[PDB]
Design a protein around this nucleic acid. Sequence first.
RNA 1: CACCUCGAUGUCGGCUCGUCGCAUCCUGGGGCUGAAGAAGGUCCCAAGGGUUGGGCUGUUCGCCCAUUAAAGCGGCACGCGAGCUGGGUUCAGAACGUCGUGAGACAGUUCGGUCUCUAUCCGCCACGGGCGCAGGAGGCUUGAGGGGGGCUCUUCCUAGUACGAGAGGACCGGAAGGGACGCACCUCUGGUUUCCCAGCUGUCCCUCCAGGGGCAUAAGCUGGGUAGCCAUGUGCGGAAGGGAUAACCGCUGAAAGCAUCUAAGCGGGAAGCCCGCCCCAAGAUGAGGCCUCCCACGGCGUCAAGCCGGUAAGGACCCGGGAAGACCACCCGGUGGAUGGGCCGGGGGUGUAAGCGCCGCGAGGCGUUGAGCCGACCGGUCCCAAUCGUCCGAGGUCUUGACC
RNA 2: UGCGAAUGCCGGCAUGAGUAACGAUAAAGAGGGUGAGAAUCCCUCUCGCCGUAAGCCCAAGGGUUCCUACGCAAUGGUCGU
RNA 3: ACCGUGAGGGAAAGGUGAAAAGAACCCCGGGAGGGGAGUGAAAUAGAGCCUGAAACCGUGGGCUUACAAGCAGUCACGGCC
Lengths: 205, 137, 122, 118, 59
Amino acid sequence: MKGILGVKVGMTRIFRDDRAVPVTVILAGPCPVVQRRTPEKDGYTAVQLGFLPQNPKRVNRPLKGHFAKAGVEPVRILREIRDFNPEGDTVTVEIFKPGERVDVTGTSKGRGFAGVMKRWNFAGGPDSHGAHKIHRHPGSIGNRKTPGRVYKGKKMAGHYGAERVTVMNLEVVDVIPEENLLLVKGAVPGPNGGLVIVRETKKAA
Amino acid sequence: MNRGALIKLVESRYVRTDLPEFRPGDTVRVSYKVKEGNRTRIQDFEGIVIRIRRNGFNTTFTVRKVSYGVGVERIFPLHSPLIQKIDIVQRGRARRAKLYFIRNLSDREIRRKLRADRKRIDQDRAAERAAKEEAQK
Amino acid sequence: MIQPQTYLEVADNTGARKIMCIRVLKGSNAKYATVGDVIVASVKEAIPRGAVKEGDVVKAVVVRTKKEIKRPDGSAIRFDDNAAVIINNQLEPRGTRVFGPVARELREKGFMKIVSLAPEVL
Amino acid sequence: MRHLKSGRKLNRHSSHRLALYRNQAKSLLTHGRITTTVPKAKELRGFVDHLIHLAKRGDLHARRLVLRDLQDVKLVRKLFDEIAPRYRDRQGGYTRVLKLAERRRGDGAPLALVELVE
Amino acid sequence: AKHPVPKKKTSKARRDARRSHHALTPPTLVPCPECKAMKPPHTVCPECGYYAGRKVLEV
RNA sequence: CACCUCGAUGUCGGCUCGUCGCAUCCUGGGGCUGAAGAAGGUCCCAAGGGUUGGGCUGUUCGCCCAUUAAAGCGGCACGCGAGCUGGGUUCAGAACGUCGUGAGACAGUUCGGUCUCUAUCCGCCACGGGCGCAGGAGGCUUGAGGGGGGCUCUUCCUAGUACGAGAGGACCGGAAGGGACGCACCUCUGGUUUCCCAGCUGUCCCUCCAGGGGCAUAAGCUGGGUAGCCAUGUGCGGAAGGGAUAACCGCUGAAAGCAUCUAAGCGGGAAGCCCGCCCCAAGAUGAGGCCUCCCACGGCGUCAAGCCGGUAAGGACCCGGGAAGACCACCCGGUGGAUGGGCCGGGGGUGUAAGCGCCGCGAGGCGUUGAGCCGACCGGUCCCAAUCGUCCGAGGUCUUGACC
RNA sequence: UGCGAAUGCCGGCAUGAGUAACGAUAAAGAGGGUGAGAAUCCCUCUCGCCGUAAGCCCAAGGGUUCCUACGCAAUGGUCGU
RNA sequence: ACCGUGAGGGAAAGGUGAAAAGAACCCCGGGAGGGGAGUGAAAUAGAGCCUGAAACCGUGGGCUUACAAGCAGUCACGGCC
Ligand SMILES: [Mg+2]
Ligand SMILES: [Mg+2]
Ligand SMILES: [Mg+2]
Ligand SMILES: [Mg+2]
Ligand SMILES: [Mg+2]
Ligand SMILES: [Mg+2]
Ligand SMILES: [Mg+2]
Ligand SMILES: [Mg+2]
Ligand SMILES: [Mg+2]
Ligand SMILES: [Mg+2]
Ligand SMILES: [Mg+2]
Ligand SMILES: [Mg+2]
Ligand SMILES: [Mg+2]
Ligand SMILES: [Mg+2]
Ligand SMILES: [Mg+2]
Ligand SMILES: [Mg+2]
Ligand SMILES: [Mg+2]
Ligand SMILES: [Mg+2]
Ligand SMILES: [Mg+2]
Ligand SMILES: [Mg+2]
Ligand SMILES: [Mg+2]
Ligand SMILES: [Mg+2]
Ligand SMILES: [Mg+2]
Ligand SMILES: [Mg+2]
Ligand SMILES: [Mg+2]
Ligand SMILES: [Mg+2]
Ligand SMILES: [Mg+2]
Ligand SMILES: [Mg+2]
Ligand SMILES: [Mg+2]
Ligand SMILES: [Mg+2]
Ligand SMILES: [Mg+2]
Ligand SMILES: [Mg+2]
Ligand SMILES: [Mg+2]
Ligand SMILES: [Mg+2]
Ligand SMILES: [Mg+2]
Ligand SMILES: [Mg+2]
Ligand SMILES: [Mg+2]
Ligand SMILES: [Mg+2]
Ligand SMILES: [Mg+2]
Ligand SMILES: [Mg+2]
Ligand SMILES: [Mg+2]
Ligand SMILES: [Mg+2]
Ligand SMILES: [Mg+2]
Ligand SMILES: [Mg+2]
Ligand SMILES: [Mg+2]
Ligand SMILES: [Mg+2]
Ligand SMILES: [Mg+2]
Ligand SMILES: [Mg+2]
Ligand SMILES: [Mg+2]
Ligand SMILES: [Mg+2]
Ligand SMILES: [Mg+2]
Ligand SMILES: [Mg+2]
Ligand SMILES: [Mg+2]
Ligand SMILES: [Mg+2]
Ligand SMILES: [Mg+2]
Ligand SMILES: [Mg+2]
Ligand SMILES: [Mg+2]
Ligand SMILES: [Mg+2]
Ligand SMILES: [Mg+2]
Ligand SMILES: [Mg+2]
Ligand SMILES: [Mg+2]
Ligand SMILES: [Mg+2]
Ligand SMILES: [Mg+2]
Ligand SMILES: [Mg+2]
Ligand SMILES: [Mg+2]
Ligand SMILES: [Mg+2]
Ligand SMILES: [Mg+2]
Ligand SMILES: [Mg+2]
Ligand SMILES: [Mg+2]
Ligand SMILES: [Mg+2]
Ligand SMILES: [Mg+2]
Ligand SMILES: [Mg+2]
Ligand SMILES: [Mg+2]
Ligand SMILES: [Mg+2]
Ligand SMILES: [Mg+2]
Ligand SMILES: [Mg+2]
Ligand SMILES: [Mg+2]
Ligand SMILES: [Mg+2]
Ligand SMILES: [Mg+2]
Ligand SMILES: [Mg+2]
Ligand SMILES: [Mg+2]
Ligand SMILES: [Mg+2]
Ligand SMILES: [Mg+2]
Ligand SMILES: [Mg+2]
Ligand SMILES: [Mg+2]
Ligand SMILES: [Mg+2]
Ligand SMILES: [Mg+2]
Ligand SMILES: [Mg+2]
Ligand SMILES: [Mg+2]
Ligand SMILES: [Mg+2]
Ligand SMILES: [Mg+2]
Ligand SMILES: [Mg+2]
Ligand SMILES: [Mg+2]
Ligand SMILES: [Mg+2]
Ligand SMILES: [Mg+2]
Ligand SMILES: [Mg+2]
Ligand SMILES: [Mg+2]
Ligand SMILES: [Mg+2]
Ligand SMILES: [Mg+2]
Ligand SMILES: [Mg+2]
Ligand SMILES: [Mg+2]
Ligand SMILES: [Mg+2]
Ligand SMILES: [Mg+2]
Ligand SMILES: [Mg+2]
Ligand SMILES: [Mg+2]
Ligand SMILES: [Mg+2]
Ligand SMILES: [Mg+2]
Ligand SMILES: [Mg+2]
Ligand SMILES: [Mg+2]
Ligand SMILES: [Mg+2]
Ligand SMILES: [Mg+2]
Ligand SMILES: [Mg+2]
Ligand SMILES: [Mg+2]
Ligand SMILES: [Mg+2]
Ligand SMILES: [Mg+2]
Ligand SMILES: [Mg+2]
Ligand SMILES: [Mg+2]
Ligand SMILES: [Mg+2]
Ligand SMILES: [Mg+2]
Ligand SMILES: [Mg+2]
Ligand SMILES: [Mg+2]
Ligand SMILES: [Mg+2]
Ligand SMILES: [Mg+2]
Ligand SMILES: [Mg+2]
């Protein structure tokens, strides 16, 4: 179930078959598999997949040269791939052919305390007529004596954004192995320079 | 990693240099490849360039003209594969970046407002009169 | 983007000068009509003795919009007004002869006589 | 929200904030060392650095440019003759901002030092 | 005087429970390079504090 | 009826935000038809989702216009005024009709008419602090259990085939386009962009000119406008599939020789149910797992669990910052360093600076010049600043079975 | 002549709470001085606001508020030399 | 006193010791205040002074508490002081 880590680089249009193709260039660098963990001593199947190299030994003792190729532990080994057993070593952009759909998981841009209406697309109040200090307010939040309380999931204002988000079934417009670049078209979450993980699609699986 | 924009600046191998120099204010004629019901012709479009949206690759420019009693504005990507070519038909003295103001103005009065950049006209000619010479012998 | 209440110029000789959108004929609840989309409208202004009269409730197709239409090849086109062509229920134009440019999106949307009658297709 | 935007607003409207920096500039370019709130300092560096680096160009254009913000015909001379040269081989960092341990009493404001470098 | 108002006097227990986080934290101090006295980090420790940057000399 | 409430349970309608029921308006599945087909009627299952925009009236309701797959009925103090409204009702003014000798009165009408900054508890949206998870740490995880989502139309092929005299016109299967809704996103399109650039008026000023500055908003006005944040813009979602079922359709089959889908059994069979997708999640005190680190100190506690120091792996403090953020938290940096600032280059905006020379009596024009100026964007560069340090942190309870 | 209640009376102290607020969005900054102590007092410079006023002179009313020295417990919505 | 234009309304507020012997001097402090010294039979009789209750606020100690839910008590057992 091929997966790979990477950083959202940017967006741009492509042109193909005399057609504009809006895409999001993600860099899916070589991912040194550092652990596997099978139903033997884990109960499932995955692949620790350390990403960006870096670390002039800000690595301390929790380092794992245990699995040979630690090639100086990477900044974010974080996240396995679950039910993926690679070409033995080092996973790269090669796992993706132009024309495959993919599921990108990202960390959506944060908006902090966002009001109902944005958080939730509420209509708020009228900007004129009666009006009165309730223009962007949520209105009523309940009934009367029964139930005499607010529902468990009542859509209200709160922190919104900066969360796990997975835009699904994205076309792979192109892949450039020379530079570990991968071009999906459109809507990958989070900011540029944020970390994402690209996976096989779930439309087929 | 800090390749950043120079990476995205790599995907641009659709960048395209076979195109002429023009500025908001002067009028140009851009030949564009259009489908047109199954077949395919190279329909032209001639008018004053209203704007230029500089952004490296995918910068875009807009041209406007009065087609049969109605003004029309078209927006082309400066590096679009469908632009077979584009010939400048006259230079104009902009004085100002974006020229939206000519919309509520269209008539004779847009003339004597955009008034032929001789300086840049006297080029082109002399710039093609010296490229037509130093090309043969 | 044309909308119920929006005024349209009439780009044909049917006799109408101004129609006013009264409904956009798409789904159960479309919000805007664009080039190639058919609307219902009231005739707000009309030439004497023309085919169509003022107050007439008619169908039309949008041939022009002040809001740019975006095309798959990355470009866009934009007109100075919103114009329509009054049509019968077969969707055949009511009057002969159409005036001014029309979006090529019309052919793509199956209005072949009108694009043909159009003095220029942009 | 208001993400990767640059430039503190110091509980002042446009003209005030602008007219502030200009004033902290003249002061600094007058005594070489100034004490302010850490934040008003952190923001003063860039404003002044520019003014100086423009003095390193010496050309009258740049003089007239610096006049816009400093308005004083001397002080600018001083800037152009006494202060500018000292940096001719220093590119950037014409300024230093060192915090102080004492806090403005009855207000609590943490202070910092702002001196011309070298 | 107006609209919402407390329905019951808050107990000594429940108010002091609110205070469970009001406790202060002593200033983070570091021994000073030159002088023996204590001063907070990254500050020009008030007794000739530095060397390269003007140490607001008490000298 | 008069049972709680008259030391007060604010009353219609609208708005906002919903949630539930099903006696189902649409979509899914069915039986019967006086069901040729297509299209209906009628009843059964089914509450997953959906259930339009306008004219009139304070209206609910209703009539009407244009649509639609449909324009569903109800409950929630005729849901919701410590959420808004205040048109209606329902104080004081005034008038009409009417009634009364009158003062005045009218589920009659008319015009007007003070809607009250501070949330204590519960509840709800968010975010932390503490302790616990019996050795202490840094990573990576399983998913018990939750939540989100669930809609639908048109056209085309099948095929003008089945069916029908004809007009009409299927099933089944397959393809492409939409509508509304949702999540994300900035390339494009389009906004803003509080000082990024230019132009302009009046006045005051520095310096007379030239050039500039303040004020004219909390931008003086105007023309533009990067980053960001955004929808009008872009990508993507509803599924597929598996399983069990409802109405129902059947197999096998007695009681009851025959017959029967049922009483024993089995098979099909819904937009529904359980999985599947997405998100949360071990305070899941039932506190799980895997990997990798430090270790088994010194006195005391003479025995039960402990007490005090230093310490180890680590971790905080402090500091530079951050598309992270109310504070906190989170993330990256901290000189073995490109973290912010400055400088440099590039992008981007503005659109040819000042100065000088030429032409003009002059306003101005031309050249130098795409000049000059230049927030945020992509980078580089130790010039400025993250100096120096401080504190916190295990040595592992017992029982039992298995092992060298 | 015995109190627990009378939205009782007088007084004291609590809760809300380190919460609302600190009274016009004309606006501030630095250097120097004084001092036990300074964002708040003095001085200098820069900036901003009034200018048919937010400047000046009368009449009411007020009644030491006037000038100066020495002072900061309280009054000053913070601090105050 | 204060409130009210006025007629008028109208309060709060007692106690060191027998005797000021009412704390010289010294220390911290700008003072305030306190610490010794000293007076006194007594100084938690020190002048915000006889006695000094209650609400109310603290500091220290014993027991107790972070998977439990309630008119807070009561009846049982058990622990620890
Ligand atoms: Mg944010
Ligand atoms: Mg939202
Ligand atoms: Mg919206
Ligand atoms: Mg809405
Ligand atoms: Mg609305
Ligand atoms: Mg609104
Ligand atoms: Mg109101
Ligand atoms: Mg308002
Ligand atoms: Mg209520
Ligand atoms: Mg008429
Ligand atoms: Mg403030
Ligand atoms: Mg201003
Ligand atoms: Mg207590
Ligand atoms: Mg009763
Ligand atoms: Mg009775
Ligand atoms: Mg009551
Ligand atoms: Mg009440
Ligand atoms: Mg029925
Ligand atoms: Mg049905
Ligand atoms: Mg039929
Ligand atoms: Mg039926
Ligand atoms: Mg039913
Ligand atoms: Mg009305
Ligand atoms: Mg209705
Ligand atoms: Mg009615
Ligand atoms: Mg309706
Ligand atoms: Mg309802
Ligand atoms: Mg009722
Ligand atoms: Mg009600
Ligand atoms: Mg109200
Ligand atoms: Mg209401
Ligand atoms: Mg009313
Ligand atoms: Mg009203
Ligand atoms: Mg009468
Ligand atoms: Mg009545
Ligand atoms: Mg009325
Ligand atoms: Mg009125
Ligand atoms: Mg009325
Ligand atoms: Mg209120
Ligand atoms: Mg409660
Ligand atoms: Mg917690
Ligand atoms: Mg345990
Ligand atoms: Mg689950
Ligand atoms: Mg659900
Ligand atoms: Mg579920
Ligand atoms: Mg749901
Ligand atoms: Mg036919
Ligand atoms: Mg036949
Ligand atoms: Mg089909
Ligand atoms: Mg669809
Ligand atoms: Mg952009
Ligand atoms: Mg844009
Ligand atoms: Mg922008
Ligand atoms: Mg001026
Ligand atoms: Mg002068
Ligand atoms: Mg001048
Ligand atoms: Mg002025
Ligand atoms: Mg002024
Ligand atoms: Mg002003
Ligand atoms: Mg200005
Ligand atoms: Mg604009
Ligand atoms: Mg939209
Ligand atoms: Mg299914
Ligand atoms: Mg099934
Ligand atoms: Mg089945
Ligand atoms: Mg049978
Ligand atoms: Mg069955
Ligand atoms: Mg079955
Ligand atoms: Mg479905
Ligand atoms: Mg998770
Ligand atoms: Mg664990
Ligand atoms: Mg693992
Ligand atoms: Mg921060
Ligand atoms: Mg760190
Ligand atoms: Mg360090
Ligand atoms: Mg840096
Ligand atoms: Mg540049
Ligand atoms: Mg020029
Ligand atoms: Mg010039
Ligand atoms: Mg001359
Ligand atoms: Mg009693
Ligand atoms: Mg009492
Ligand atoms: Mg008293
Ligand atoms: Mg509060
Ligand atoms: Mg508050
Ligand atoms: Mg406040
Ligand atoms: Mg104020
Ligand atoms: Mg001083
Ligand atoms: Mg002194
Ligand atoms: Mg000052
Ligand atoms: Mg001062
Ligand atoms: Mg002040
Ligand atoms: Mg007098
Ligand atoms: Mg006096
Ligand atoms: Mg005086
Ligand atoms: Mg004095
Ligand atoms: Mg005082
Ligand atoms: Mg004082
Ligand atoms: Mg005071
Ligand atoms: Mg006051
Ligand atoms: Mg003094
Ligand atoms: Mg009085
Ligand atoms: Mg009096
Ligand atoms: Mg007494
Ligand atoms: Mg006595
Ligand atoms: Mg006596
Ligand atoms: Mg002393
Ligand atoms: Mg004493
Ligand atoms: Mg004594
Ligand atoms: Mg004695
Ligand atoms: Mg005694
Ligand atoms: Mg004593
Ligand atoms: Mg005593
Ligand atoms: Mg006492
Ligand atoms: Mg006594
Ligand atoms: Mg007392
Ligand atoms: Mg006595
Ligand atoms: Mg006493
Ligand atoms: Mg205690
Ligand atoms: Mg439990
Ligand atoms: Mg317990
Ligand atoms: Mg509780
Ligand atoms: Mg109890
Ligand atoms: Mg006991």
